[PDB]
Design a protein around this ligand. Structure first.
Ligand SMILES: *[C@@H]1O[C@H](CO)[C@@H](O[C@@H]2O[C@H](CO)[C@@H](O)[C@H](O)[C@H]2NC(C)=O)[C@H](O)[C@H]1NC(C)=O
Ligand SMILES: *[C@@H]1O[C@H](CO)[C@@H](O[C@H]2O[C@H](CO)[C@@H](O)[C@H](O)[C@H]2NC(C)=O)[C@H](O)[C@H]1NC(C)=O
Ligand SMILES: *[C@@H]1O[C@H](CO)[C@@H](O[C@H]2O[C@H](CO)[C@@H](O)[C@H](O)[C@H]2NC(C)=O)[C@H](O)[C@H]1NC(C)=O
Ligand SMILES: OC[C@H]1O[C@H](O)[C@H](O)[C@@H](O)[C@H]1O
Ligand SMILES: [Ca+2]
Ligand SMILES: [Ca+2]
Length: 337
């Protein structure tokens, strides 16, 4: 049962996390052979909280594949910057599994991750890679990542370093979500690089009736100002086109969700841009961006935000341009993952 409500996005941090490998070289940050190595950790929910979903940040020397409860949720590489991943969880326990690869002979090897678990009651806790994870001094067995594998006589992982103290130094957090891939949109009264003074509304519905939606993460900015609504409830608002806002919606409807925006132009150019990531209970996700599949209207009707209004006399939203275009450029400050 979920009492958590929409909130400012809380970044997962690598500060308490550790670099792990097998200990085949007993020198942490020491030279290791070209190899692939498994890592597993069963994490159980405290008390009587349920776990709902997780924000994940993961970094690797040299590369990684990340699994949750047997499902591949991502592939990545590199220790200078982490990769953001989002996933729905089982309510009481979750098996995290990583395949790490060292790709350069005589080079250091290591995996670092932070798993920020969001609970049914609106609390969070960070879990990290450390000595309590299990590994093998061999290539991963077939199905090493499924819960059905017994990791009981696997050895402990060996710590290679901490966030501040390691051969790698501290990885930079990635952006929570990319704006690359999204579009500044407006009503079709936005011509010759300016739009009238006034408020305009935008709507997007996601409805996969054969899947169970769990959590959404939203990244949004507007020239001049916006208010954002999910299923008619206020999520938040901002007034900056140079600093974006990120939100978590932990209480999604399982099949049908409507995002609505009242955005206001104070004068000159105008636009609204957003990236939305939705997690599904099978471990899959969907990305939605501001584009021409959104609906827009120039006079905002009463109830523009309720989920099931009549969209007659809403137009396709106009693409002003892909993220990057003048006048706003590529420099938006995006919260960390
Ligand atoms: C959302 O899910 C999919 C798979 O369930 C992930 O990715 C595709 O998977 C890889 C892994 O990063 C990407 O490189 C590709 O771009 C996708 N396939 C292509 C282009 O063929 C993705 O990681 C997940 N997102 C999360 C967990 O945040
Ligand atoms: C992860 O740990 C959990 C909790 O310790 C394991 O869960 C269970 O295992 C018991 C013995 O099989 C069951 O009879 C319990 O009902 C159940 N406990 C809870 C709290 O759910 C779980 O199997 C582990 N998963 C993996 C992949 O090891
Ligand atoms: C859309 O947003 C704008 C601004 O966020 C809303 O505007 C105004 O309406 C108030 C009436 O409640 C007035 O007191 C203010 O003069 C004015 N406020 C601002 C900050 O402009 C607008 O009503 C919003 N809603 C709709 C449905 O248009
Ligand atoms: O980036 C263009 C910028 O310039 C204008 O004159 C306005 O004050 C802002 O609302 C913004 O639209
Ligand atoms: Ca290496
Ligand atoms: Ca403006």
């Amino acid at each position: 049962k979920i009492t958590a409500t929409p909130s400012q996005f809380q970044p997962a941090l690598l500060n308490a996390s550790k670099w792990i490998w097998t200990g085949e070289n007993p020198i942490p940050g020491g030279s290791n052979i070209i190899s692939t190595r498994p890592f597993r950790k069963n994490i159980t929910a405290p008390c009587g909280k349920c776990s709902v979903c997780a924000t994940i940040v993961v970094a690797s020397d040299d590369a990684h594949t990340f699994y949750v409860n047997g499902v591949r949720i991502g592939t990545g590489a590199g220790f200078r910057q982490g990769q953001a991943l989002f996933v729905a969880l089982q309510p009481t326990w979750n098996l995290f599994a990583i395949a790490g690869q060292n790709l350069v002979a005589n080079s250091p090897a290591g995996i670092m991750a932070s798993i920020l678990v969001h609970f049914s009651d609106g609390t969070s806790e960070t879990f990290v890679t450390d000595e309590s994870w299990k590994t093998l001094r061999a290539a991963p067995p077939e199905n090493f990542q499924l819960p059905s594998t017994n990791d009981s006589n696997w050895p402990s992982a060996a710590v290679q370093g901490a966030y501040q103290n390691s051969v790698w130094g501290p990885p930079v957090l990635p952006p929570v979500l990319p704006l690359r891939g999204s579009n500044w949109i407006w009503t079709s009264d936005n011509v010759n690089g300016a739009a009238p003074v006034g408020s305009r509304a935008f709507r997007k519905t996601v409805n996969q009736c054969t899947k169970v939606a769990v959590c959404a993460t939203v990244l949004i900015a507007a020239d001049d100002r916006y208010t954002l609504y999910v299923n008619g409830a206020t999520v938040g608002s901002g007034s900056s086109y140079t600093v974006a806002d990120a939100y978590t919606i932990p209480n999604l409807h399982p099949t049908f969700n409507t995002f609505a925006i009242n955005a206001t132009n104070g004068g000159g150019p105008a636009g609204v841009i957003a990236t939305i990531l939705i997690t599904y209970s099978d471990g899959s996700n969907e990305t939605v961006v501001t584009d021409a599949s959104w609906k827009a209207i120039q006079t905002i009707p009463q109830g523009f935000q309720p989920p099931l209004i009549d969209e007659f006399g809403w137009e396709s939203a106009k693409i002003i341009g892909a993220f990057g275009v003048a006048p706003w450029g590529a420099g938006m400050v995006i919260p960390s993952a």
